[PDB]
Amino acid sequence: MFMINILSLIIPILLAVAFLTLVERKVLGYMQLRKGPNVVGPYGLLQPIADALKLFTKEPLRPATSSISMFIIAPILALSLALTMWVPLPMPYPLINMNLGVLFMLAMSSLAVYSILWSGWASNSKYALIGALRAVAQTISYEVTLAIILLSVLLMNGSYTLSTLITTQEHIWMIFTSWPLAMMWFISTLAETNRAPFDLTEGESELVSGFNVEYAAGPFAMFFMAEYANIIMMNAFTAILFLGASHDPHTPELYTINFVLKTLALTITFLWIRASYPRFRYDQLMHLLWKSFLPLTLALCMWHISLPIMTASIPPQS
Template sequence: PVLALTLAMTIWSPLPMPAAHSDLNLGILFILAISSLMVYTILGSGWASNSKYALIGALRAVAQTISYEVTLALIILTTVFTAGGFTLSTFHNAQQTMCLILPFWPMAMMWFVSSLAETNRAPFDLTEGESELVSGFNVEYAGGPFALFFLAEYANILMINTLSTIIFLGSPIPPALFTSILIIKASTLSLLVL
């Protein structure tokens, strides 16, 4: 659970802020790499709970996460070709004249569906198995570890919505207002997802 929250907090580091301390050259690849490591926390927590139901739930979660990460990576790759770079600030520069959601409308819809599946939101919440009595890989966790898992899950939801805002909903705004507008857009998108 601690590793899941640590990875969920680390994934926020390449975000383009006005006074960014870490504007990574390969920010998109860093985000994809860290989100791929989340699979190990799910599998490890399902195995460590020493329950066959938790292990089966972890295997379902890993299969779903890996399969939808491939589509997210391919969609990001097409937008990277258009933006011209792997840094997240190049998306801001590429959208000075027009938001990328307009020419990439089908990609944006596929991104939205894949991000719902990646974050285990309905109707892709197969990992929790609400029709069953078992709650997936976190069935044996309670209290602090359970809270850490769900803090990590909601941090990932906020991150993927912020990334969606940066990639598809950018706009020509002055740097002083960039953070405020980004937070408003990502919060609105998060309210739609939750």
């Protein structure tokens, strides 16, 4: 039955990614006085299927200068980790219940970076190398702030167990307790997924296509799916951490729905930001994350360490 659970957590996520592509296109269109995909299927509902079939029926090209092994391993690592980072998510019950699921998520994200690195390096192109170096610089800028903010907001949780987040927020969303950390975490998640004002690894208007410039057909589809799956997963993480939802143990559907709606709202805000701001310069991205967030993240880490002790509100260990 566990294999059935694995399939019921992977296939629906891939379908959600496929339709999130269409949702993003239509949202951008309607925010640009346009109409998203509207011909292929009713209201464009068949566009993702057409895109997938085109990509997987498209000839994939293997660059002559490319290192084949890494060039093929990178896409696999990207998708596998994108699908794996959903394993510990509590909705309301996690598939795999870890005492340290949060650190597992951090480690899985840190590994996913190497997909962009190796894809860029192995592509053996100047634009791909620039994209890989930009990914390196991006992960240099956000990782420390990401971990510090996550630690500070989990100091009121009592452990790194993700399921406990539901209990901690049983009377109040944790965003009412750490909204500056919430803002900084949201921006860090934007930077991490190579997303709005931080689309520097891909850089459509500056690097043609970034690290995936030499990728076509299937592998390109896998990188896109991994990117959007990471988007949805990170938005789900933001939902569980700050926007807690009521969980009736006898009717888990209530939580599931509330959770899904919050994640959808966060993804829609991701697209909203994508169609509202110009792109950063990765020098400015690193300067922001190192000189405006990091000092403030350290200060708020001090504050959230001292607060439970000074208010006698240390959360339970178990």
